Amino acid sequence: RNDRKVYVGKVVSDKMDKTITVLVETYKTHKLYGKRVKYSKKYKTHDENNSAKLGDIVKIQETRPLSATKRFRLVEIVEE
Amino acid sequence: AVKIRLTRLGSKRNPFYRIVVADARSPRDGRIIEQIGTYNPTSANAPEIKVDEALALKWLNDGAKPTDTVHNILSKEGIMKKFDEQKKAK
Amino acid sequence: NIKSAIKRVKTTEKAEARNISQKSAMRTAVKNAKTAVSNNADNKNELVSLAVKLVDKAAQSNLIHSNKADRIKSQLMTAN
RNA sequence: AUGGAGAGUUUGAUCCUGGCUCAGGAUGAACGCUGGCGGCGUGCCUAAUACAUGCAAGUCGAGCGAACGGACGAGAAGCUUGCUUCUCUGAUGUUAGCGGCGGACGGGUGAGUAACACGUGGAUAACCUACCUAUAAGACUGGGAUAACUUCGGGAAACCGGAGCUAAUACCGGAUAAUAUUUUGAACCGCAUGGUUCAAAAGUGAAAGACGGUCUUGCUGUCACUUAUAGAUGGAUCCGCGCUGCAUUAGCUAGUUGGUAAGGUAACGGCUUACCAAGGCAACGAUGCAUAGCCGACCUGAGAGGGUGAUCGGCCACACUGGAACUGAGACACGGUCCAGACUCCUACGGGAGGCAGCAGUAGGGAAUCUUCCGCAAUGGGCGAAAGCCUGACGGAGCAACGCCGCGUGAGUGAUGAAGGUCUUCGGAUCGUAAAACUCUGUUAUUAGGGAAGAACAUAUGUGUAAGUAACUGUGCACAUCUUGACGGUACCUAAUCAGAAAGCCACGGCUAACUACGUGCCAGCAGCCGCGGUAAUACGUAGGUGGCAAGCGUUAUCCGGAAUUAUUGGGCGUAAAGCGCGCGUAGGCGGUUUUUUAAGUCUGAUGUGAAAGCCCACGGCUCAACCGUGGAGGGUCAUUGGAAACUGGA
Ligand SMILES: [Mg+2]
Ligand SMILES: [Mg+2]
Ligand SMILES: [Mg+2]
Ligand SMILES: [Mg+2]
């Protein structure tokens, strides 16, 4: 029933075995001056088969803790 | 233990109790589970009472046990009678 | 010191003695059963049954948690 | 539309720039002078310094044995037939002890913490949960101990040690029983891991009795018990976002980042350990240093914002400092255990006891913050079937103008402008309707009577009625009747007496409401800033008068405002402070015209949530108000979901 958060982002490093780090980009607004400013957050997600490669735009979903800092799992590779 | 009880409000020499569902260990006047009504024992020389029968019955069925005064209040409102009838003829 | 506190000290010591005796017994049985399963022995099934009996009786006495007993039983019976 | 004031000061004079200062609001305030009452609040902000003394956690005899007392009432006559013993029966009770539950709640404090700690919104197909409620199945058959108690021994004590005996709802073996665990077949489903349900085998896991009713060679009511399942409650973990200063802190990290295996935990996971690789974080500020409990809220401001985190509520953390586990559903446990350290006290020197950041109080520090009070009568909590017991939570008294609010210190007529103070042009002017005198009132005060609500109850007793039983007791419910108040004979009401007990503080040069006299003479002194004082000072001191407030009035400290003086709203850089000496250029920022498309930004609905209390609006109750309660309204940069496509972003 209840679904879990899903994010789409580019892969910025895959040197780890079966792990890819996904860079999700957002635009937070300055609380006083109101301007839109870029915000990048790197997500450590599980890559079981090493299918994802550095550069491709992938989709990840939140899971239970899988490692010290891995909390997400790769769902599909939207683009490459 | 879940319980339906009276939490004090008002002022010195002027109490006003609210009827609240609360864990027994929670403080009086502190954390509550859900409020169900009010009980003013100093109004018009006759204790004013308001209660939500649906919530009272739901919590009694779930397992909340009233205190002495709340039991009397529920009897006066007739909630105890309906609860007993429902339990017996379930 | 409070009277009930002193009573609790005494009862705590007694309960600790009993619990540690039983826990040591169950640990010994589990170790013996695991060794027997690792090196096939004609006594294997009887030892595993004794280990399971003591594990569950300890779990019911609350010396170990039910989930701990379940893990012990699972690993023991998968080995055997 | 509900909302926004300025003034002084740079000059011979001016406009501008610019800082400085003042008028406002607020406080857990302190101090000075003064001081009548009532209500509602508030009261160690410093030393998370050390603590004398009293108290702050017990309860259950309807789980258990034993002991105290021993009623009702058994026997001889001491001829004392009213006092006598042990040879009995032995009631209501009580208790040292085992056992159950509680003690992890309630209460205190904010030291630590820059962190998923807190707030908000989600997730757990990675979780645990005693007491409570409901349903299903059971609660069978045996056993050995040990407290208590008796006796000896050792110790100052704390407390131990040996021997003998005795129970249980204490402990243990066995039987039966799983959705629990393994294995083989399935079916359907989701978001990787997987989840759900159906079969067939193997291994294994429980329990208790107590008090009553009955037709009493046997069934049954209440409580208690075991297992399984749900619910409820409580707890745990993960994640998005938000949340503080410093770069005169630029590198940090080696269990570190990932993987495989194992162990471990309720639970996933480098949580831990072996092996393989070299990863991981960081200018979008890592690391380091400094500071800090977070929040609802609170103060201020027209708002945008700025400041704060008392009381009250939520969450977190801690309990002399540090480490550790045991018991337990729950703790690594404020008034529990062990060890180390520092510190108090007892000792027979061998050894022991302890931890107010619980409520009072003491010393100390400080400008500064309460009495070693009454009571469980109300609410709440622990145990018990219940009566009931415990509860410094809590409900209430005492102390403090510390704050807010309410009412007083008299009201009417009173020119006859009395006397007296002050000034004076010596006419008078003013204090002044002020006073006196007359008339009235009793808020308030004094005395005497009446005297609430807060009280629901629980329990007990009669009557019914629902489930189940063959029936009965009991169970729940409904209606009835006696009994329960510390505050306290307090509030409040009634009757009588007296204006009689009850006004002080600052200011009067401008800002800024209020001016004269005398004394002093760049002295004494004042001062927030400009300044005032050297002989005729509205600025010093006193006096009269006046102004602003009033049981308060001033001073000091701190925050916001005024300050557009960090300018998003809402400022600037030729000469007032401010364009790098100038290029080449990376990141970032921004970007020409049209069409199609997307829907991240943007806009518009629905749903959930943003606790209560608080601010605001309305209503209601205290004689009003403060205060209290009720219902609205608002508060997100929040989350899912449906719509729109001009603009920014992507194609
Ligand atoms: Mg601190
Ligand atoms: Mg404790
Ligand atoms: Mg210049
Ligand atoms: Mg130039």
The two tokens of residue C49 are: 């049954």
Count how many domains chain B has.
1
Q: How far is residue B79's CA from residue C12's CA, in Å, rounded to a whole number?
A: 46
CA atoms within 13 A on the CB side of B70: 26
Q: Report which residue type is found at A10.
A: K
Helices C66-79, C3-38: axis angle to 10 degrees equals 10
> B79 is in which domain, residue-wise?
1-90
Domain region containing A53: 1-80
In angstroms, what is the C-alpha Rg of chain C? 16
Dig out the tokens for C16 from the structure: 């600790």
Nucleotide whose C1' lies closest to the alpha carbon of residue B20: D612
Structure's resolution in angstroms: 2.4
Q: Tokens 């879990």 sit at which residue?
A: A4
The β-bridge partners of A7 are A60
What's the burial of A35, exposed, middle or buried (CB within 10 Å: 0-12/13-18/19+)? exposed
Nucleotides on chain D that have an atom closer than 7 A to a protein CB are 39-41, 57-59, 98-103, 105-107, 122-135, 171-174, 178, 180-183, 191-193, 202-206, 226-227, 231-234, 237-243, 256-260, 263-271, 277-282, 284, 305-306, 312-315, 326-330, 333, 335-337, 353-354, 378-382, 393-397, 452-458, 466-467, 476-479, 568, 588-590, 600-601, 611, 627-630, 640
Query: Do residues B24 and B4 lie in contact, with contact meaning Cβ atoms separated by under 8 Å?
Result: no
Neighbours of B36 (CB within 10 A): 24
Please give the structure tokens belonging to residue B65.
């046990």
The alpha carbon dihedral of B19, B25, B27, B33 has a sign of negative
What distance in Å separates the CA atoms of residue B25 and residue B12, rounded to the nearest whole number? 25
Give the torsion sign (CA, A5, A10, A16, A19). Answer: positive
* Six-digit token string for A19: 């792990």
The arrangement of strands across the sheet holding B14-23 comes to B48-51, B34-40, B14-23, B2-11, B65-66
